């Protein structure tokens, strides 16, 4: 099994990993679009649904 | 206590991106508080605030302009940057560059420009550059009147001095006409002592920058 | 097609009645309600009464309340309004107008729905109100004195309106004629102008023909430079 | 977002006489609202902030008040160096929204132009265009009429104007009118004149040459 463990990081803080193995590391960092400065990539807001039916 | 100097092409043809530098001196774009600014005003139109960039990465673009403008600061070049995407004949307007200070008891963040710069003209036109031909206004109870005529040229502007920035008392330089061909025109005429024609030298210098033309005319009688 | 044409209307002298008819054609069954609005030139649009299926309106407005009466004949297909004991402001283009109710409303097809919006509007019938007595206009020119202006000023008419054209309509360009004005007296004026090329003036004839039909009156006048 | 309805739109005024603009937003912005002045080709510069502050360099003769929904620019005697576009502004909330400005003319004495002709330059007829160029210098009010007249038959559509801004010293205007012709027409007539008329000149004012002298 792998488990995953994540966290929320303050602008201008350090995340420290330290391990002698059985680490799965990430190689990218996700960033969310609502907190975005207006430079175009923001796209503010969403509504997360749950649903069976096609799209229209 | 800071100066702020705008550039970039002058004519830009639709669909195409808009780039725009201002060359800042006096202060460093590093600076945690100022902000820096572009605000636009289409010919006969309002201003129209484009956004603001921080050092730090925080911006605000006009929703209006928002997804097709981006800002950024070069810090190497101590100049900040406008790009505007696919754009069409609604852009064609002065872009101002512009300074303000983080202000909160005040003003609302980055909402303050308080040092502009003097604009640059972009064109958004399929229209090709032309550079000017330029003829003189040679002279007929005391005075005297002369200049330059500065003939189809594409876009604006140009830029007159008579002697190099030496000759500036009593200068007119007159608004372009768009003429029915679609080329610009305009004068630039100076005072003098008629008792000066006989004697004194006179060259207009008509610069443009888009056809990277300069020409001199020196004026006297016919 | 749901269109409807308004007939009558015209001059009447205040106190007296004129009722104007709305002939109902196209999608329009006539089990659906139906309203005039009036409007006077130089004034908003004012509602004035609606009708439904039969007897349900009874629905005038506080200025008609003594006055207008609602018809309708579903037998013709056609919406009337007699207007009685008319003033002197009741001068205005009435206006047939469709009702239409949302379909949550109106439980019974014929009755009334007390909540109607007007969707589709017809063309309107004027009808003025005064003492006056029809006029035809006197046409003074507007002479002349690179781009000259000229024209003819149409004077002391009654009722509205005038036709202006300029060179039998081979004039267009730069042709404004404006909106009439009604004087003390009670008759209107307006002008019409023209704007032309100076040099035009010496080779080219200008004649402005003016049509008041109320009176079948028709002039040419031809503006000179003088 | 915030709509800001700046009025008068322009005005004229003597010198020394009291100026007032007013500008009233869309919502209630408090003091969060800015003036700036734009004379012709220059920086537009921030005159007063946040409602009544007076920014450095700016004369005392202007002074902001108001808040909420009503402001106030007054200029207490009007100079000649005040001609400029006048605009307000709001800081209260994203995007800065500016009004559409309000421009402020001078009223001074009538002042009658000084005409000038200037013929076409022998080095533009070879490119097969003549240009006479027609000067008024420093003249007040703005309406000056040209004509242009050729061996003395009236032009029409064959010449444009174009008029400075008023003069930020001595708040005149100037004007060129520029006749423009084939060279082969040109050298088919011989006189060429300009006829100004305007109200500082008693009866209208010809300046003339002829060609090839």
């Known amino acids: 099994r792998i488990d995953f463990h994540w966290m929320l990081l303050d602008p201008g803080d350090t995340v420290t990993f330290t391990f002698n193995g059985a680490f799965i590391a990430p190689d990218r960092a996700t960033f969310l679009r609502s907190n975005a400065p207006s430079g175009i990539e923001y796209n503010g807001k969403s509504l997360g649904i749950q649903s069976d039916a096609q799209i229209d | 206590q800071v100066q702020l100097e705008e550039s970039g092409p002058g004519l830009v043809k639709p669909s195409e991106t808009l780039s725009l530098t201002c060359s800042v001196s006096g202060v460093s774009v590093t600076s945690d508080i100022y902000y820096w600014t572009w605000i636009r005003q289409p010919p006969g139109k309002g201003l129209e605030w484009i956004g603001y960039?921080?050092?730090?990465?925080?911006?605000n673009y006009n929703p209006s302009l928002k997804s097709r403008v981006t800002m950024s600061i070069d810090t190497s070049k101590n100049e900040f940057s406008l790009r505007l995407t696919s754009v069409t004949a609604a852009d064609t307007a002065v872009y101002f560059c512009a300074r303000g200070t983080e202000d909160l008891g005040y003003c609302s963040s980055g909402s303050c420009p308080n040092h502009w710069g003097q604009g640059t003209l972009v064109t958004v036109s399929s229209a090709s550059t032309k550079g000017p031909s330029v003829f003189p206004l040679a002279p007929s109870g005391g005075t005297a009147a002369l200049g330059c005529l500065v003939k189809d040229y594409f876009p604006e502007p140009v830029t007159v001095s008579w002697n190099s920035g030496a000759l500036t008392s009593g200068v007119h330089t007159f608004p372009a006409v768009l003429q029915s061909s679609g080329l610009y025109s305009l004068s630039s005429v100076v005072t003098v002592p008629s008792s000066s024609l006989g004697t004194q030298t006179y060259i207009c210098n008509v610069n443009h920058k888009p056809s990277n033309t300069k020409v001199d005319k020196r004026v006297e009688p016919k | 097609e749901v269109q409807l044409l308004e007939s009558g209307g015209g001059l009447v002298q205040p106190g007296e009645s004129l009722r104007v008819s709305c002939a109902a054609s196209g999608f329009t069954f006539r089990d659906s309600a139906l309203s005039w609005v009036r409007q006077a030139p130089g004034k908003g649009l004012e509602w004035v009464s609606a009708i439904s299926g039969n007897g349900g309106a009874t629905y005038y407005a506080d200025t008609v309340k003594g006055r207008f009466t609602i018809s309708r004949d579903n037998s013709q297909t056609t919406l009337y309004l007699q207007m009685n004991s008319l003033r002197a402001d009741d001068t205005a283009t009435y206006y047939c107008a469709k009702d239409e109710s949302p379909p949550i409303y109106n439980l019974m097809p014929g009755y009334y729905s007390t909540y109607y919006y007007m969707d589709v509007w017809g063309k309107g019938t004027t009808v003025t109100v005064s003492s006056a007595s029809t006029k035809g206009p006197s046409v003074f020119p507007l002479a002349p004195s690179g781009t000259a202006a000229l024209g003819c000023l149409v004077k002391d008419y009654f009722p509205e309106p005038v036709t202006v054209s300029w060179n039998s309509g081979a004039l267009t360009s730069g042709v404004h004629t404006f909106p009439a004005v009604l004087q003390s007296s009670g008759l209107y004026s307006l002008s019409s102008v023209v704007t032309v090329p100076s040099s035009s003036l010496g080779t080219q004839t200008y004649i402005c023909n003016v049509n008041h039909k109320p009176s079948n009156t028709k002039v040419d006048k031809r503006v000179e430079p003088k | 977002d915030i709509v800001m309805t700046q009025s008068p739109s322009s005005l004229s005024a003597s010198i020394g006489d009291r100026v007032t603009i007013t500008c009233r937003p869309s919502?209630?912005?408090?003091?969060?609202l800015n003036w700036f002045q734009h004379k012709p080709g220059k920086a537009p510069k921030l005159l007063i902030y946040?409602?009544?502050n007076l920014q450095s360099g700016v004369p005392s003769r202007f002074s902001g008040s108001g808040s909420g929904t009503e402001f106030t620019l007054t200029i207490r005697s009007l100079q000649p160096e005040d001609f400029a576009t006048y605009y307000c502004?709001?800081?209260?909330?994203?995007?800065?929204?500016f009004g559409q400005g309000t421009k402020v003319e001078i009223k001074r004495t009538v002042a009658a132009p000084s005409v000038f002709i200037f013929p076409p330059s022998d080095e533009q007829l070879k490119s097969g265009t003549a240009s006479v160029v027609c000067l008024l210098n420093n003249f007040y009010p703005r309406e000056a009429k040209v004509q242009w007249k050729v061996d003395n038959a009236l032009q029409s559509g064959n010449s444009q104007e174009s008029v400075t801004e008023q003069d930020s010293k001595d708040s005149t205007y100037s004007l060129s009118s520029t006749l423009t012709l084939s060279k082969a027409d040109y050298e088919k007539h011989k006189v060429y004149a300009c006829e100004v008329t305007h109200q500082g000149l008693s009866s209208p004012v010809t300046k003339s040459f002829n060609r090839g002298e």
């Open positions: 946040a409602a009544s």
């Open positions: 919502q209630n912005i408090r003091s969060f």
């Open positions: 502004q709001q800081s209260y909330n994203t995007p800065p929204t």
């Open positions: 960039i921080f050092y730090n990465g925080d911006t």
